[PDB]
Enzyme design. Structure first.
Site, PDB file in Angstrom:
ATOM      1  N   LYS A 147     -21.227 -12.872   3.182  1.00 47.24           N
ATOM      2  CA  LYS A 147     -22.681 -12.921   3.310  1.00 47.24           C
ATOM      3  C   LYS A 147     -23.154 -14.375   3.231  1.00 47.24           C
ATOM      4  CE  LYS A 147     -26.949 -12.880   1.299  1.00 47.24           C
ATOM      5  NZ  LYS A 147     -26.625 -13.737   0.132  1.00 47.24           N
TER       6      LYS A 147
ATOM      7  N   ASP B  69     -26.152  -7.778   3.951  1.00 47.38           N
ATOM      8  CA  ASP B  69     -26.302  -7.506   2.529  1.00 47.38           C
ATOM      9  C   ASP B  69     -27.010  -6.157   2.416  1.00 47.38           C
ATOM     10  OD1 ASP B  69     -28.949  -7.894   3.131  1.00 47.38           O
ATOM     11  OD2 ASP B  69     -29.166  -9.793   2.054  1.00 47.38           O
TER      12      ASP B  69
HETATM   13  N1  LIG Z   1     -30.762 -10.282   4.344  1.00 48.19           N
HETATM   14  C1  LIG Z   1     -31.350 -11.445   3.708  1.00 48.19           C
HETATM   15  C2  LIG Z   1     -30.355 -12.565   3.514  1.00 48.19           C
HETATM   16  C3  LIG Z   1     -31.089 -13.764   3.017  1.00 48.19           C
HETATM   17  C4  LIG Z   1     -31.789 -14.711   3.713  1.00 48.19           C
HETATM   18  C5  LIG Z   1     -31.980 -14.935   5.154  1.00 48.19           C
HETATM   19  C6  LIG Z   1     -33.142 -15.526   5.637  1.00 48.19           C
HETATM   20  C7  LIG Z   1     -33.293 -15.709   6.995  1.00 48.19           C
HETATM   21  C8  LIG Z   1     -32.253 -15.343   7.838  1.00 48.19           C
HETATM   22  N2  LIG Z   1     -31.113 -14.787   7.395  1.00 48.19           N
HETATM   23  C9  LIG Z   1     -30.999 -14.584   6.081  1.00 48.19           C
HETATM   24  N3  LIG Z   1     -32.408 -15.565   2.814  1.00 48.19           N
HETATM   25  C10 LIG Z   1     -32.107 -15.165   1.542  1.00 48.19           C
HETATM   26  C11 LIG Z   1     -32.474 -15.721   0.323  1.00 48.19           C
HETATM   27  C12 LIG Z   1     -32.031 -15.089  -0.817  1.00 48.19           C
HETATM   28  C13 LIG Z   1     -31.194 -13.975  -0.757  1.00 48.19           C
HETATM   29  C14 LIG Z   1     -30.824 -13.426   0.449  1.00 48.19           C
HETATM   30  C15 LIG Z   1     -31.273 -14.033   1.629  1.00 48.19           C
END
Ligand SMILES: NCCc1c(-c2cccnc2)[nH]c2ccccc12
Ligand code: NI
Length: 315
Positions: A240, A259
């Site tokens: 991830k 995730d």
């Molecule tokens: N499914 C969300 C994953 C994620 C992202 C994210 C944002 C933009 C594009 N791709 C992923 N920013 C985060 C910040 C904290 C925890 C999980 C994330």
């Protein structure tokens, strides 16, 4: 002394990049979990650090305005040409978002509905080091807390740049700074918990096993699958986190970080269930399969598509 600028305050120190708000909305991008270093210090004005400089940004319907602070008391001036190119690249404005949006809408009526209200979500092109440590901090964490962790990390380990109102800005530290003997102890004092150990250990591994940050630049020109696997050899980086770094910093637009939230979107909004696999919930294999599903649907900018849904869901 120095104060955060507004466009009204100090017009002679701002420059403009032609940019429709349909190509970029600052408020759906700068604090929607990509960079953790931008804050709206005054209404519609966003301040943050890019590469050992501080910027402030604001936009109209058709223009992106920006101002730079060098700080090393050079004289105040408008941003130069090179500095404007830096920013154009940071927002990857060569890529048309409107064309990507219709390409995705053409096969996905869900995305089409969400896209009506959430225009201008695109991907920053971030520094690999910063993005890597930021996402190591992201495990079991939220935007607001990561933001604090990252900010304290930079104040404790990276160089001072400038102060504006009550805010002291630091550059992101180099690897050797995060790899030192007390680095983990210090980071725990700064509230990173277990993530402190992975920060220090990853810094050390890149430095000693991989030859320093030139390795992350090589991953930037290597193919997606190769970069992803190499990142997963690092302490605290799994599929991830590695997919985030691939998407946000190593020019892999097809990387889809899977995730619990994307699982929920897939199931709820798309009716997806694992087919090849039979583990009915998250698993290494079912998560790989779900990343493949999105790539199959949206095409090679799948990472950007799913970014729209993430920013959408944050409101
Ligand atoms: N499914 C969300 C994953 C994620 C992202 C994210 C944002 C933009 C594009 N791709 C992923 N920013 C985060 C910040 C904290 C925890 C999980 C994330
Ligand atoms: Ni179901």
């Amino acid at each position: 002394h120095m104060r955060h600028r507004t466009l009204s305050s100090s017009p002679a120190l701002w420059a403009s990049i032609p940019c429709p708000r349909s190509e970029l909305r600052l408020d759906l991008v700068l604090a929607s979990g990509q960079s953790f270093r931008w804050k709206e210090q005054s209404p519609a004005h966003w301040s943050g650090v890019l590469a050992d400089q501080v910027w402030t940004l604001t936009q109209t319907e058709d223009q992106l305005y920006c101002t730079v602070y060098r700080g090393d008391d050079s004289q105040v001036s408008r941003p130069t040409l090179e500095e404007l190119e830096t920013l154009h690249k940071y927002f990857q404005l060569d890529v048309s978002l409107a064309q990507l949006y219709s390409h995705w809408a053409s096969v996905d009526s869900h995305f089409q509905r969400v896209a009506q209200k959430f225009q201008g979500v695109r991907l920053l092109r971030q520094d690999p080091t910063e993005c890597l440590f930021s996402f190591i901090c992201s495990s079991n964490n939220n935007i607001a807390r990561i933001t604090g962790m990252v900010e304290r990390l930079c104040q404790a380990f990276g160089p001072r740049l400038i102060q504006l109102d009550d805010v002291t800005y630091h550059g992101f530290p180099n690897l050797h700074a995060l790899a030192g003997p007390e680095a983990e102890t210090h980071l725990r004092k700064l509230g990173l918990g277990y993530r402190a150990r992975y920060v220090r250990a990853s810094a050390k591994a890149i430095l000693e096993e991989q030859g320093g940050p030139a390795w992350l630049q090589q991953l930037r020109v290597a193919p997606y699958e190769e970069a992803h696997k190499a990142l997963c050899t690092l302490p605290g980086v799994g599929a991830k986190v590695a997919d985030c770094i691939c998407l946000m910093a190593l020019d892999k637009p097809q990387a889809v970080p899977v995730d619990v939230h994307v699982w929920q979107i897939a199931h709820r909004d798309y009716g997806w269930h694992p087919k090849t696999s039979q583990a009915k919930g998250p698993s290494p294999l079912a998560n790989k399969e779900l990343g493949n599903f999105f790539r199959n649907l949206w095409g090679p900018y799948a990472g950007w598509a799913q970014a729209v849904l993430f920013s959408a869901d944050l409101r």
